[PDB]
Amino acid sequence: PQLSPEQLGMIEKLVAAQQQCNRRSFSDRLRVTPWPPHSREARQQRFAHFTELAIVSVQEIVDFAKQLPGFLQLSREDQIALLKTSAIEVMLLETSRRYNPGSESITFLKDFSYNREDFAKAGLQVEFINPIFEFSRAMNELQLNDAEFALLIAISIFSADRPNVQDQLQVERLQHTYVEALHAYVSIHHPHDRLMFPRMLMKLVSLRTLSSVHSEQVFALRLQDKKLPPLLSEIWDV
């Protein structure tokens, strides 16, 4: 697997696009309702806080997808189809990127880490929380860098098998270029481990199952009469 100039430049742009997308959302992330003892008030503010982290994350996911080669040449209909369903997967990937093995926590905001109990307190059910942290544990063992995450995210977005994709041929053709790019990149980063490439790809399999568990989470919110904010409701509610 021979890393070409075209692939190298492309991986670097993704990595720079991701860093550029994050600074664009610095101010919007500054006005997230602050994380707050035992009241209906307190559990709404934590839920508000978490959902507002997710809102900004979707902003970043959209921005990053616009910089993906071939993404904007898809119809806007196909663009929406891809993002609606990959967003949770991209978010779970970014979550696993920020995992702290020692404390089994996730560091979203910089001086502030969230463990399993904090997720529960933020409104999430344990049937979703536990698999997030298990997936995050397993992903941490793989020690992916910026480049491998950027490409895993791109591969996840360019999935021809999402609901309602029209140009399945082209979406698949685009995914393949990021698969090859990853294959070639992982041959430089891990030249004595031909398993690292397929192990990364295999995590997309685990992600599909987390997506399904997430749908059950969104359904439980309905029964809790806990309403998602408009962007999350638009992409996640039935």
């Binding site: 979707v58 959209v62 616009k66 209909e77 663009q79 929406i80 638009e234």
Partner: peptide, 15 residues
């Protein structure tokens, strides 16, 4: 269309 049912996402895409 998906587009008419995803107005915020659509606006984020437009810019």
């Amino acid at each position: 269309s998906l587009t008419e049912r995803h107005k915020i996402l659509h606006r984020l895409l437009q810019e």
